[PDB]
């Protein structure tokens with residue numbers, strides 16, 4: 001805007017020093033984009049150029065958010081965050097409503113554009129500095145530092161938090177039942193209305209925001225049903241499941257029971273009471289593998305019993321808000337991927353499976369990245385905090401392509417694995 | 428002379444303060460030499476006298492070493508650097524020559540007194556203070572402080588190069604045709620003009636500079652194409668690394684061997700074929716940079732083959748953004764892969780190699796992929812885009828592997844190249860058990876202590892065997908156990924292990940390994956017609972494993 005506001009003094013963690021992160025290499029295409037974006041921001045006064053006395057640096061990526069013709073700048077403040085927000089998880093902590101997950105529909109709408117109006121504490125800017133790369137490192141990176149609250153920064157939502165619960169207040173006034181959660185750049189509005197009623201209530205909010213606080217969310221489709229449209233509706237009341245099921249069949253073989261006693265035995269680690277020793281006794285012989293055999297008695301009392309101990313979830317499984325969430329994904333096949341979000345071995349708080357398309361657009365990567373953003377959101381909703389993904393993908397590869405289909409404004413914390421072996425039959 | 432270049436505001440790390448490293452009074456003539464120079468620098472403003480009303484100090488040294496035509500001043504600033512704020516790392520990454528665009532004409536201006544021309548933040552001068560000594564023990568106190576960028580202080584290259592860029596910009600704009608690249612003290616100006624008018628721009632650029640107290644080569648030029656830069660031989664239309672001499676001896680220490688290897692890689696950029704999986708193979712298992720190593724046979728062989736290549740000169744061409752980046756990979760052998768990135772048939776932008784991973788079990792398809800990768804990455808950094816690959820693998824052999832690979836992948840676009848060696852599926856395991864095929868309940872175990880083991884099996888057909896093993900571990904036997912079955916099994920077989928390890932290993936369909944055995948358990952996998960490997964739990968998992976658990 002053009003209205004200087006009282007800047008909220010920001011100080012990193014105790015004896016902590018700003019970020020100094022490597023700005024990964026980019027395509028010429030994206031550099032041109034970013035250059036374009038920034039040249040403009042520099043004009044709207046949002047950012048400025050710096051000198052060599054600014055040693056700090058946070059990474060930047062160019063991505064298209066709504067696949068829309070043009071790009072969006074995506075700053076990876078994952079580092080400036082731990083160095084601050086964790087005392088802005090305290091100092092200005094933003095509380096997580098345990099019921100939003102219960103609602104019938106949670107539409108998710110952007111608000112990041114609000115922040116660009118609150119000037120940033122002068123002596124902090126020096127930290128929001130980033131660099132637009134040079135191809136082949138010919139020229140010096142272009143160097144910019146922020147002047148208003150930066151988006152990727154989990155400290156803008158915390159500062160704005162005030163200006164928001166105000167704008168939103170004369171709306172929660174009326175529609176009280178609707179819960180609203182703010183996580184960084186997004187707003188999570190949840191309701192129980194009939195789809196259409198809800199969807200209308202949202203637009204009812206869209207314009208409230210828009211008109212009152214000039215904030216500016218966005219319109220899903222542009223008044224047109226091309227049969228390739230959406231609006232980002234989540235239906236939390238819809239999730240919980242047990243994809244872990246022993247196969248029910250008529251005739252079993254050695255190799256069939258074998259692979260069964262296998263998993264079943266493994267399952268034991270996650271599920272408390274599960275004994276298999278009599279069903280397995282049916283295997284103590286050096287019988288061929290194709291040879292069919294029928295189920296014994298004390299054995300038949302196991303498949304039957306254990307099939308049922310596979311409907312009643314673990315016990316000691318509670319959410320420790322001191323520890324953080326870990327998410328493990330495994331390539332399942334034909335565009336199918338299973339996943340767990342545990343906090344300590346075998347104490348999963350949730351397991352589901354992504355699968356959106358296998359033959360046409362299906363790309364091992366584009367799948368995973370989307371799978372990741374899905375698994376995230378779920379947790380941002382369920383627990384109001386993103387997990388730490390253990391991606392079954394080669395580091396260099398993922399580092400090259402995630403930005404290709406990453407549409408979200410936030411960026412989780414990932415790490416790459418060796419090889420889920422038997423944990424693949426978690427299918 | 429000094430400039431009207433506004434300075435970069437500097438600070439000393441938090442809490443910290445100016446350095447007070449007192450001077451060790453020393454040597455009359457050299458104790459005048461400085462004063463001889465100081466009063467000369469001071470004249471030109473580079474420095475200035477100061478009372479001891481305020482500051483600290485730093486060690487001033489007089490040092491002559493050349494063919495002795497004059498002595499030179501020096502000031503260790505370390506106890507200052509240790510107190511100065513961090514700056515923006517100058518040379519993050521050097522531009523690779525393979526991605527520069529040819530310029531008809533190119534000149535190199537040698538900005539000289541650079542540093543002493545850029546000014547120094549007024550309030551950070553007080554720290555650059557130093558003092559040249561008395562005739563002997565009677566301090567008169569010749570005190571001065573720096574007004575320019577002192578000769579070895581942290582914030583110097585940064586603030587220098589920072590100031591240059593600012594100075595260039597008007598010019599760089601009044602002439603959007605002259606590409607200037609500043610590296611340290613040098614300025615390389617390239618363009619596509621008639622050598623006549625290209626000389627003009629240089630002089631203009633040259634005169635521009637001079638108006639900001641900066642000076643340049645008055646022999647009107649100082650260009651010696653090709654340029655010796657960062658270990659490259661830079662011509663105006665090609666590039667290489669001339670001084671690439673790998674000497675020989677009859678004594679090779681961890682030291683000389685490394686040094687040889689290093690020099691060898693560096694050449695990989697453009698010298699098609701270089702290898703090193705042998706001369707390095709040696710290294711692991713030591714950290715004695717003076718210990719003599721026996722130049723093994725392959726090492727002697729490979730080193731030769733590198734000489735054959737290197738003996739004959741090879742060049743590198745430049746980048747034309749007008750065409751397409753093609754990069755192609757060929758397999759060499761011992762987990763070795765080479766490649767080159769061309770836009771033209773007989774030209775090359777760059778060449779390179781790819782060495783395998785873990786000291787263990789990998790795979791030809793997987794590797795070929797890690798390669799397409801290595802390159803996709805490289806390419807992005809140099810040319811800013813990914814190249815069009817051409818590779819020795821058919822859409823089938825490939826798609827089959829990832830489809831079966833538990834790990835995600837994404838190979839950009841590629842075209843088949845029927846040039847061997849070829850990357851293929853040397854075998855595949857059956858997915859369902861084989862009806863008819865004898866079933867082998869294999870197993871093993873060894874004494875962690877005694878290192879003595881057993882490897883055997885028991886078939887449904889009631890066939891048994893137990894073979895003794897020496898110098899072995901639980902794992903090596905469990906594999907030997909399989910190798911065994913495969914060995915005694917007929918063209919079609921079903922093997923059954925209790926070792927998650929042996930399973931997994933084989934499952935990865937490795938084509939090669941550094942475990943003589945696995946190469947054996949492969950050699951046979953390949954021979955076999957249809958093989959099925961199945962996993963069952965160790966002890967409670969005593970399926971058909973009832974008999975094989977302790978008889979073995």
Ligand SMILES: CCc1c(C)[nH]c(=O)c(N(C)CCOC)c1Cc1cccc(C)c1
Nearest residue numbers: 138522527528529606608615616617656661
């Ligand atoms: C290698 C020679 C060269 C070519 C072919 N093309 C250029 O544009 C150029 N410069 C004017 C601009 C370089 O910009 C990044 C140089 C000089 C140079 C000298 C030493 C090192 C390099 C990388 C380039």
Ligand SMILES: [Mn+2]
Nearest residue numbers: 870871872925
């Ligand atoms: Mn065993």
